Amino acid sequence: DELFAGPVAESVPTSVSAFSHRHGRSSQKMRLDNDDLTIAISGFITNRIGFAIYIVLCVLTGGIAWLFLRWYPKYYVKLVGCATPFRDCQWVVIEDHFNKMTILSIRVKPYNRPLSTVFGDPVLRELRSITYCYYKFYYHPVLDKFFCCNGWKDPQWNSMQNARSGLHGDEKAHREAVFGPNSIDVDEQSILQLLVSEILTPFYAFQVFSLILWLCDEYYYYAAAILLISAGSIITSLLETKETRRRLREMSRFECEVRVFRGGFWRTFPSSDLVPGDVYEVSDPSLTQIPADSLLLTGDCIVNESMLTGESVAVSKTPATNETLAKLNPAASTFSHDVDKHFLYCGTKLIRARQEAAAVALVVRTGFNTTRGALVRSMLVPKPSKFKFYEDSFRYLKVMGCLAGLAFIVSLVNFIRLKLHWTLILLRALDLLTIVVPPALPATLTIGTSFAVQRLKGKKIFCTSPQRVNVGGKIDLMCFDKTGTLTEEGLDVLGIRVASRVSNRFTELLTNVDDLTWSCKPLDPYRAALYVMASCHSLRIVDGVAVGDPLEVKMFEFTGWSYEEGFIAGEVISTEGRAPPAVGVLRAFDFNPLLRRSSVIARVVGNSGGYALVKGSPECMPEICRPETLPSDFDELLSYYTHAGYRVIACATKRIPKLNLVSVNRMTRDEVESGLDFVGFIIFENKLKPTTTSVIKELLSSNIGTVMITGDNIRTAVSVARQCGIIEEHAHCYMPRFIEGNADDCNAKLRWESINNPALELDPWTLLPMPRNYAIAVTGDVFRWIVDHAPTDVLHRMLVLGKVYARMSPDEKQELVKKFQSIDYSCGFCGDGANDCAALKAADVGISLSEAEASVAAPFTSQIFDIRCVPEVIREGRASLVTSFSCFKYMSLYSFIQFTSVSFLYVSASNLGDFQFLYIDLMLILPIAVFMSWAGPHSKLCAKRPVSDLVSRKVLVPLLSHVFVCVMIQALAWVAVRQQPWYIPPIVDSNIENSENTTLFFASCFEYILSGVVLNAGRPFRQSPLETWPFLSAVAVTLIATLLMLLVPPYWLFEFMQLTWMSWTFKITLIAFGFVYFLIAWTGEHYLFLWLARFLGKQRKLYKIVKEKLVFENLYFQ
Template sequence: MSESIPSSVTGFAHRRPRSDSVASFKYFQEEDESPDWSEDQAVVDDDESAISFVKPGESSYDYDAEPALDSDEHRRSSAYSRTGAEDSLLLRRESAKSDFSGFERESRTSQKLYIVSEDLTIVIAGFSTRNLGFAIYVASCILTLGLAYLVLRWLPSWRVRLVGTSRPLRDCDWVVIEVRSPFRRRNSRAVTKRNQNQWGEMSVQNLGREAYGQGLSTVFGQKTLKRRSSEYDEDDDPILYELCTLDYRYIRLCYHPVRDKFLLGSDWTDPSWTSVKSMRVGLDSEERHQREQVFGRNEINIEEKSVFQLLVDEALHPFYIFQVASLILWSLDEYYYYAICIFLISVVSITTTLVETRATMKRLREVSRFECGVRVLSNGFWRQVSSSELVPGDVYEISDPSLTHFPCDGLLLTGDCIVNESMLTGESVPVSKIPVIKESLHLLGNSSNMMPPELAKHFLFNGTKIIRARRPQEGQDEEAVALAIVIRTGFNTTKGALVRSMLFPKPSGFKFYRDAFRYISVMAGVAAVGFVASFVNFVRLGLAWHLILVRALDLITIVVPPALPATLTIGTNFALSRLKKKDIFCISPQRVNVGGKLDILCFDKTGTLTEDGLDVLGVRVVHRPAMRFSDVHEDAQMLLPGASYEMDPTVDYRIHQAILYTMATCHSLREVDGELLGDPLDVKMFEFTDWRFEEMGQKAGDDDEGAPPGPSAIARPPLGFNTRIEEVEGHQDTPVELGVLKSFEFVSQLRRASVVVGQSGSTGGDVYVKGAPECMNEICDPQTLPNDYEDLLGYYTHRGFRVIACATKHITSLDWLQVRKMTRQNAESDLTFLGFIIFENKLKEATTEVIEELNEANIRNVMCTGDNILTAISVARECNLIDRTAHCFVPHFLEGDFRDPKARLQWRSIDNMLFELDEHTLMPMPAPAEADASLPPDVSNVWNYSLAVSGDVFRWVIEYANPEVLQRMLAKGQVFARMSPDEKHELVEKFQSIDYCCGFCGDGANDCGALKAADVGISLSEAEASVAAPFTSRVFDISCVPEVIREGRAALVTSFCCFKYMSLYSAIQFTSVSFLYASASNLGDFQFLFIDIFLVLPVAIFMGWTGAYPTLCAKRPTASLVSRKVLTPLMGQILLCILIQAIGFVVVRRKSWYIPPVLNTEKSNIENSENTTLYGVSSFQYIFSGIVLSVGPPFRQTMRNNLPFVVTVVTTSLPHGKKKRKEYKLVLADMRM
């Protein structure tokens, strides 16, 4: 089967539930987290002092109610949360030991919550304002002229400590939310008590409170009421008199008074949604008003800050405040020209930032905000309303021609539609949706993070484009319309998740920026030392006090350059611009630098490495009674006798007819404007038959038991094409029509799809199944499998062909009631095997070239596919992802299966079955004596090998194998086949757990989880922005991968170059000024102006203009500032610059023309030989530092390709003014003597 699932989406919130964050929190008090008991299951932490219990099925994702937690992970993480409690900023309050009633125990003051969709661990702590503390806060702000306000704004925890007092969540006025984004856990060496790869974030949020007066279940759903009845006295659904809500990052949480915590309401379901018929009733006005209170309006409305708010946020940034202080300092020192220039630059910078921010937010608001008119069923009548008024439970019409996009997340109730979901998944193939059935309703509101395929085929996602929506076929009823029910609205929808991912991108865990700011703090310490030294020296020289303070403080502005943060983003911005020109778009700029560190890349196969379209090579059917495969039928007309050839009496043509009928009916195609839409494999298969296809529309719903269901589609043979075996035998000629009565969509776990088909003029019916050859053993009668089944399958899969197996079952008597009640298990059992359909899966033109380029760059390539393992190996070898001369070992279960913890694996080479691996170490066993001596020497070398692993073996190794086997599998595995979407996701996380920087490239269909989990995810999609991945390429091949890596490496190197240049600039100027301060001299106003504005700034900017080097090399750029490789050369260059200035400073004093500075206690003397010498020497040091640090190959182009930088260097190297040229010549001539 195809790897893509055109009728389903596997999920858009692709984060596995984590047991805990390794972060520690200031405000979390573990005593507040009283255990929630579950009658079904409890997972207990091994720390007796901090026991947490897992309640399955909860939707809140709270730590004491988190489903599917791994107990080992949970035990490992508990130590970290305890660390946070011990370091708690606030005193720990002792809470009473609770019974199960939230009303009878002391309320908790804080809670920990894990939000799966955002991969966030947050702590919510309740506070109230303390009057005395608030008064002190206001007074200190006034008395310090706003300085206290700034300090407490930058250090919000201090403000909370001063103003707030801890209060129970039920009574608090506002809350503090502390955030950790839990990055993947590395090996034990990389994990510390406080994870150093996490950025903490804290915010203060107000609560919304309003009168409500409805039952708890209307807010939290029915499942939160499945508790012990003693909690609620006599009422099973107590009244919630006040609705307390908390909106954080556009996620709404509601306070549950019984559970005494805030819970998410994003997966709320109405208890009445038990059948399709009940869902079609709609809501009355009172219910709509009540649900709007709980869920808000159906708007993705991004809060737009005013110009004043943006100005305040930007201007009050610590670096701008530092600049303001510097401007005041320079003005007091009469550096007016320089201060004015810096002021104008700051104003331009702030203005530019405001304009860009406003424009970006405006574009995002335009993309996210959508409002249209919809027809809604309310109080039993249809009325036109705005889509912003929709609430969960509303029933609206989707067959309205004016409706072009779905305004919310919903379920299709009646009719059918075809939609384009590329914005969400990157899947360019249109997706068909069919009405929901009762059996799928129980999947609504489950706490799983993945959208079940059984539900996704009925689910309508907000923002997806409607290609076609058809009304149901209701006999003569022309009033029937296609209906959908609203499930989620606003930011709770998938489109809301996409917008949130743009507003709050996931931190990359990249340490460069954190190290840069640490370096700044070190330089600030150096500045403090310089301040003290200068202060003492100036006092010794007897300078005026105002001059002492001004000069000493001026050193701080020199050592800590305010422009440093801006220069660190130069390389990233240039890289993004170059990528955009190549049709590669990025919604997460910080991922660009991460792309430069990739050392492993996982590729999907179909649609990524190979073409989407598959050409049918032919069909091979089973010959009975010989029980062997026939020759290849390269034309569908060759399957049945007719004009092309005479009937062979030894052939059972019923098998030929059945496989032809399978290809004509077992697919998920839809017809729009005469064009077939659907999975490319299905399209090619159906076109191979030359049949005609006609859709008949869907019935109103499964709950309408009165009317028998008609076929959803009819397949007809081409005119003149003989398809009836009876006709050959002389029976009456009647037209053939195959009607699809019921479909079981492709499910990745089952790896097959099936249809129930009725034939015109027949009282019986048939089940036709197509799927992976591996699954046929489970569903087919073993007696119908040919003797050469495995041999033929191996023959084609070894050569890279795609093989689909077909099977059938005849039902002698079939009525509509049987069809209605038929389950998938009944339909797909006791089948008769028919044969193989063989597809050619051609590589894309760019695949081999890109794989070879990545191999040469020593970047490991891995295939991760849902296809057959032998086919995957063949494709991998064809594109050189696997060495063609290397052994490839494939595991098989020797005992048991993937469900058996005691199962045993046997690893054998597919090239020579005599070669095996040790099952405990995955190391090659000695080559047997009978090994084929004719093999080439490099193939005979068993140590040259790779692994190919199937999904079931991958699952068993992760769950039951010893760690050594898992590590070896991850280290040597090159092909991972038959992988489900969830297993692809887990594979990426496993690679990351062993310190790989992992990228994933896929078409977005079933790869959403892996794309988002990867350090760098690249989706091949037509959409500019996709929730599937941070990078999206409109070029539909993997040529985008080396481009991202090249630009990532160039951006990373540029960031390091700019950082080191700004560090050198600070050190050089600090040295010059320090030497001059020794004699109470200084640089002049225009000298500072020339250095900072006309020399350093252009060099720093144009240094980042250099493009990426076209060839990827095996060497990778460093990503850590705190390393000897970076700091040693930097310190060496700083010392060299200091030494050169020191030589100039000493030498100039010995010259006959030396003009010593005249001591002036009121102002600095700048007209002296020391000033001229140090200014000239330092100016060339700035220029030469830029040249030295402008790194070229192997990561960036050579300097000569950067014309603006070359012009800047040449221009700034020329002395300006006759007097200066004369002074430079004199100084340089004397220094040579």
């Protein structure tokens, strides 16, 4: 019924943000309607022990019990809580279906108003409300059970005469008390461990254990220095994260002035004020967005729901009648088409409204019960607690299993030779137990992620979860939306295909504006088409930019003319000079949806003859046209320009002569609606963003797959994916459609038909074509049927072969994202709208293009509104992955040499040096560790992926082999000095003045200071280590400091260090061992160590198996 004749807006916005798999007194059980949880609400009170003994239990234990028990709450409830009915209690516990306990309290507010204004008796003062994850559960006093929510919002507007009256008096105060403020104000993060737990790496749980081994004043300075640097790193990282989150929240805040009609008067109010029933105003300007989802009462409007739906077309809404209001209920997640036809939705950008007359609208839902609010609230409900720390939760297991062998080796001997039993457990506890992971590791990982976050925030992308920056290196496919993400949210003019009179056919697409200077007859078709483009629009100009129907705005911006005020004075042609005359608009008729056309009567300055210009939809012009001028290719071109996905309008003209021209045009519409001659077509399409095609081409050419998960028509989605590079050219799409009638039954059959051919693939069992590459484009309902009724192999083959997914509700988007992650395929998601919030937290790396919407808990948010941010957040992620492993391969190796630096000292019954270890860990490890992890990516997203496994040979074999080649050279130095006769090695036999200790400390010092350059994996996926300032300067200055310690030691360091005299010849040989270790490690790690790891070496990823299976099956021609 709209102007265009193509794909039409059909997807209503839904609040469902969780996929439900189809299957073919006190302590109640209840299920949230929006997202499936089936929670249990149990109300307890505080017993006669309560927290009175819990407080002193926490005090006398040192506070460890409180920290341990807050993570495991289920017996805290048993210890403290006492079982009472929750009619009169003050403590509640919330249980999910995955057994997670949450503790809340009940607030009580005197109300003193009847039950009809809260539910649906007069004496009601209890208002027991619990806000569990922004779900407001209230207590029904007549019953004894908590209700689901306040989603159903007391409908009392049926009379249709009090609907426009509005609320007055103190009723608004009580409504505000019940339903809360309209703003979706999330709970801001608390600095008391609420945000710190996100940045608290579990390795820090070992760190305090080290303090237990260091609170005995054994290393008085070392523990304080490590605590200082770790606390500083943690504080800066959490402060940066909190500032970024608060900044994103401060542009996430929305408030707009609205003319709320209350008490019979129009008052200007902030947007975060409306409560259900306050009837508000639309028609006045500066209302760029709908404050709360509402119901129309007077006047039509056109709004753009490109964020609550994927629909690019601006949906037009009409006033609701009395029957319309008597059908809806606010508790419905998805509204019917009749209700949605007369309905405004919260957050949608308002495009046009009609001009004391107004476009007054009655708000029905506020707060988190709005569709935007419901999607935002259901985004924040689930939590992947132990998801990403598990990948490091097994490395220390194999590290302690490896060092258990060394501990057994060194304890096989000293247990009987020179050490007793009571003393021997403390040298192992103080030294070996604390260096299972070095204390500098969790303070260097946080510094590395902070450097990555700052490098990203340089290029206009903010990170809200700094722990997610290293996950981006694991991405092998990115999932994209369409409207706002890839293409712009509105329709745009593609070109003009006029109909030539001489050839009786169309001419060419004519993308550029050559309509002005191309003639190719009483009237030229090009001039008439241009006059339709620049004259037929009923646009009210305001501030130079046109406002109104988006099609009219886009054609008026495409022609580039200057429309004057809306009367007998018309527009003027552009005075650039590139003999076309100017034309003025006499009278315009309203666009009648019943007639599906709009007409204007214009008058040109030059010829001074009347013109009638009518544009409407095709397949309605041919029944009101003059058929002699219509081209024979009308239906063929219509099929080509509609079945592809574009939307076209058909314009036509006719000439009113001078004698038929009347100054007072009291002449009816139907006179100029017959006998017109046709001129051509105007095509509307979703223009891609100018950089989207290049980014998709680079991402696809760099071994990263791309799919598209939109929410609009499948034909437009296929056309956009074809012209952006997701589907490679001349590859047939294949749409599944249900046959044999059944569409919601388990025994239905799907025909996978080609989108523009009678050919089809084999039935769902094997997705192969009949007797070359192809792509699969699945709509929404068919995917919902497949995911719960089709076999597992069919679902896997579709997910592997699929590249376009359209008409997808947000719950289906989340289900498809999870089904990618059901197999071991790691997918990110490039969403922007409120549709995307379900599929943004569930994905690993969820980049949010919209700054305000869908960025409340998305791990990334781009300031630039295009796909150019997707490369950096991938490649820097890779630069934040291998570098992290370049710390993991470096720090743990640091542990093992330390054990050798202890173990050989147990040959001479010494342990270590008090000051040499302090110099090693602070003055040489930290300037290597935190400055090795400071370098940006290569700025070229390579096809090969980093080794992202802590189980594979490519990490363990180089690590253990570097450790062994370090032990061999340290043992060579030890045997050398032991048999070196110029200076006898004094075994004094706590003992710190050993010459063996000094000559082994210097060798291990060279080991630590040369192992950082070799292990710095900078060349493939980062900047090369040839960059002198970031990393080479630090290693150079600490190498010069070490050489000053060795070659020319001053007397002052003799007061510090316990060094003894050394010969020049031995010093030279020591330098030779250091340089041969560097040469061996550098030629090994790059050429031989990975060679040995590969030659030393099942459980392959599911996606790869499906790729090989499909490709191989296709080689045999079935």
